[PDB]
Scaffold this motif. Structure first.
Motif, PDB file in Angstrom:
ATOM      1  N   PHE A  40      82.601  69.299  -7.504  1.00 33.10           N
ATOM      2  CA  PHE A  40      81.037  68.812  -7.495  1.00 33.10           C
ATOM      3  C   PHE A  40      79.793  70.429  -9.268  1.00 33.10           C
ATOM      4  N   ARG A  41      80.347  71.062  -9.063  1.00 32.57           N
ATOM      5  CA  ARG A  41      80.064  72.190 -10.251  1.00 32.57           C
ATOM      6  C   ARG A  41      80.486  71.647 -11.728  1.00 32.57           C
ATOM      7  N   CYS A  42      81.512  71.196 -11.896  1.00 35.38           N
ATOM      8  CA  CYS A  42      82.632  70.429 -12.457  1.00 35.38           C
ATOM      9  C   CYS A  42      81.705  69.606 -14.270  1.00 35.38           C
ATOM     10  N   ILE A  43      81.691  70.251 -15.515  1.00 29.89           N
ATOM     11  CA  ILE A  43      80.819  69.797 -16.151  1.00 29.89           C
ATOM     12  C   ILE A  43      81.759  68.081 -16.855  1.00 29.89           C
ATOM     13  N   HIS A  44      81.747  67.067 -17.023  1.00 30.68           N
ATOM     14  CA  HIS A  44      82.975  66.491 -17.150  1.00 30.68           C
ATOM     15  C   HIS A  44      81.714  65.338 -18.606  1.00 30.68           C
ATOM     16  N   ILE A  45      82.767  65.588 -19.863  1.00 32.27           N
ATOM     17  CA  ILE A  45      82.270  65.234 -20.897  1.00 32.27           C
ATOM     18  C   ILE A  45      83.395  64.029 -21.693  1.00 32.27           C
ATOM     19  N   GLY A  46      83.006  62.706 -20.969  1.00 33.07           N
ATOM     20  CA  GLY A  46      84.159  61.638 -21.786  1.00 33.07           C
ATOM     21  C   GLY A  46      83.529  60.870 -21.349  1.00 33.07           C
ATOM     22  N   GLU A  47      84.429  60.139 -21.041  1.00 35.38           N
ATOM     23  CA  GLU A  47      84.004  57.908 -21.377  1.00 35.38           C
ATOM     24  C   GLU A  47      82.337  58.643 -20.216  1.00 35.38           C
ATOM     25  N   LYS A  48      82.539  59.290 -19.756  1.00 34.17           N
ATOM     26  CA  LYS A  48      81.495  59.557 -18.015  1.00 34.17           C
ATOM     27  C   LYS A  48      81.124  60.643 -18.731  1.00 34.17           C
ATOM     28  N   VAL A  49      79.740  60.969 -18.719  1.00 30.92           N
ATOM     29  CA  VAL A  49      78.784  62.093 -18.980  1.00 30.92           C
ATOM     30  C   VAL A  49      78.011  62.327 -18.137  1.00 30.92           C
ATOM     31  N   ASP A  50      78.604  64.404 -17.770  1.00 32.08           N
ATOM     32  CA  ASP A  50      77.446  65.094 -16.449  1.00 32.08           C
ATOM     33  C   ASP A  50      76.026  64.127 -16.772  1.00 32.08           C
ATOM     34  N   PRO A  51      75.214  64.089 -15.746  1.00 30.04           N
ATOM     35  CA  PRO A  51      73.889  64.078 -16.520  1.00 30.04           C
ATOM     36  C   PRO A  51      72.852  65.036 -16.333  1.00 30.04           C
ATOM     37  N   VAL A  52      73.473  66.711 -16.344  1.00 33.51           N
ATOM     38  CA  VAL A  52      73.033  67.728 -17.226  1.00 33.51           C
ATOM     39  C   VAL A  52      73.275  67.338 -19.036  1.00 33.51           C
ATOM     40  N   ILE A  53      73.966  67.221 -18.890  1.00 32.17           N
ATOM     41  CA  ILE A  53      74.630  66.903 -20.709  1.00 32.17           C
ATOM     42  C   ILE A  53      73.206  65.860 -21.183  1.00 32.17           C
ATOM     43  N   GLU A  54      73.068  64.612 -20.784  1.00 31.90           N
ATOM     44  CA  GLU A  54      71.585  63.550 -20.690  1.00 31.90           C
ATOM     45  C   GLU A  54      70.775  64.098 -20.642  1.00 31.90           C
ATOM     46  N   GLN A  55      70.868  65.018 -19.703  1.00 31.69           N
ATOM     47  CA  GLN A  55      69.013  65.477 -20.016  1.00 31.69           C
ATOM     48  C   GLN A  55      68.666  66.444 -20.771  1.00 31.69           C
TER      49      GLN A  55
END
Length: 119
Positions: free
Chosen positions: A57-72
């Protein structure tokens, strides 16, 4: 601290790929917003006695899909999300858990440990 330090370690690692590539001032704000964003999301999902719990749940993923926090963080710092994704390592996973910060570049890449306090 109990969560502050770990988030700091992960943030440092992440924005190191953005400096020298994107506007210095915007990268700082991006980091500041991401920090506030992670603290808010992690609250209530941080168990020192069992760091593995809530790790996915805490893991920040940044690949084909990206974590909403990065977008925000991008939208709140004037950075284009595609510039951010383009400068970070492909298929990146960043784990922020109690007593440990780590990442992995590639679904099958090795898990690298940036910070660890095994007591």
């Amino acid at each position: 601290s109990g969560m502050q330090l770990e988030i700091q370690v992960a943030l440092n690692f992440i924005i190191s790929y953005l400096y020298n590539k994107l506007p210095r001032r915007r990268v700082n704000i991006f980091g500041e917003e991401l920090e506030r964003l992670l603290k808010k999301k992690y609250e209530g999902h941080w168990y020192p006695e069992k760091p593995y719990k809530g790790s996915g749940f805490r893991c920040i993923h940044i690949g084909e899909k990206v974590d909403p926090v990065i977008e925000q963080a991008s939208k709140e710092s004037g950075l284009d999300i595609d510039d951010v994704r383009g400068n970070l390592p492909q298929d990146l996973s960043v784990w922020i858990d109690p007593f440990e910060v780590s990442y992995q570049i590639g679904e099958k890449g090795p898990v690298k440990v940036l910070y660890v306090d095994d007591n």
